Amino acid sequence: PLGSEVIQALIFKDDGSLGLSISGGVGSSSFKSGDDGIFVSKIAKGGPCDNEGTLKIGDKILSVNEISFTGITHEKAVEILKNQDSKYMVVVERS
């Protein structure tokens, strides 16, 4: 997208959670018109994502720990984000 920026955040799980919610994915209703991507749709107050402070509602997730989130389902996105790691390098596209 014109004027878009690519941002990265390193977030550590606390009690098994990153403190954010996702929407979208291939095979789901699109969060943004015409974009089947995975998007940050909620950030829990006082959670790890809020504390680190880099990510924002509306960010499109491009990768997590170098796993591409382009062309993946909501279900696959969730599996990855619920995996056994505690450390997540999240790359997003902000528009």
Binding site: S17, L18, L20, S21, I22, S23, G25, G27, S28, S29, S41, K42, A44, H74, V78, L81, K82
Partner: peptide, 8 residues
């Protein structure tokens, strides 16, 4: 189409 929102 399904429109999930999942907390992680």
């Amino acid at each position: 189409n399904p429109n999930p929102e999942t907390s992680v």
